[PDB]
Amino acid sequence: KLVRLPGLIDVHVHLREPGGTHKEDFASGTAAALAGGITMVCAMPNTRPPIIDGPALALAQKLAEAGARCDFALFLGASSENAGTLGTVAGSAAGLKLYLNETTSELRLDSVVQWMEHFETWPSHLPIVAHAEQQTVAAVLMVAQLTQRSVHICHVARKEEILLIKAAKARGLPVTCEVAPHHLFLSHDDLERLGPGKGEVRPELGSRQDVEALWENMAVIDCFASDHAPHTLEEKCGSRPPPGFPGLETMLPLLLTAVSEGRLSLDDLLQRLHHNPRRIFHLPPQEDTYVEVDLEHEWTIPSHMPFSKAHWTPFEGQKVKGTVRRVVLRGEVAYIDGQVLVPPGYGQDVRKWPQGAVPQLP
């Protein structure tokens, strides 16, 4: 007997188009999403060109409309030049992304004052998410309080970070967060197997104590999100390995394994991959959309999953229980047992749906 799940949402993916399409493109990345039981993705802005201005957003929107197989929203990225310039297009984006740690010259912010300027100028009803590690979590929380608004913390990876967020929630502060599967299912213990190139990711893999703290503090985690960050094996294994792991095709099987072991409940999973993504980002329902999973099927993750152009995975060799059998997206069969059955361009920008605009005061 299969279990019917709603259409799951991944609020943190890197689909590499424009400009990095040997790593992934909208068509391959959304195939990966569908095969992972994900029917809606929010794509990050660190493409080439980066999505830091209205022309780049317009290009990315058209590339996504033409290539995506599942539905999507596109983030804008904060830069050192664009605060106060995004007001006309802000509501068309998933939200604003701040890269507050090591990043590219185009997305780099050199001063906390620039963070403040973004918090002050970005429309106050629209989402802001941050790559903010270690003390940066506390720093961006301070900026959010100074500017009297919410913030969402991407890929929480450390005991330190989850406990800081827990303390902030205990004080009633408007902060939410997400955790990626590699920070729940991999640790320093895996670095020997992965090697130093494949093992490169930001935030880095944590200690066993970090992993245990995330599980212990599941109540603090609002969302799961993959941080799908595909790079080719040649890049990961070469002289200057870029950080990141592909993860769309493995996230749900890993989490279903944990459900089957009683580490979290089915409801806990659906809050974190469906209801909380919807409510934090004001993402609309998808009509006639669902995912059928087989919870009994035991398998071992292979050296690469079928769809991502990354063509490698750090979870190779892990034994999992649970698999996606069928996905229906807006009344059409999108995926069955290893075959994607909707073409590039079937997917739509959810921010253009009437129900997909973020409500605001006039």
Ligand SMILES: O=C1C[C@@H](C(=O)O)NC(=O)N1
């Ligand atoms: O912050 C980031 C971005 C990402 C990428 O490759 O785009 N990969 C990572 O590991 N961390």
Ligand SMILES: [Zn+2]
């Ligand atoms: Zn990040």
Ligand SMILES: [Zn+2]
């Ligand atoms: Zn994120």
Ligand SMILES: [Zn+2]
């Ligand atoms: Zn990311």
Ligand SMILES: [Zn+2]
């Ligand atoms: Zn529900």
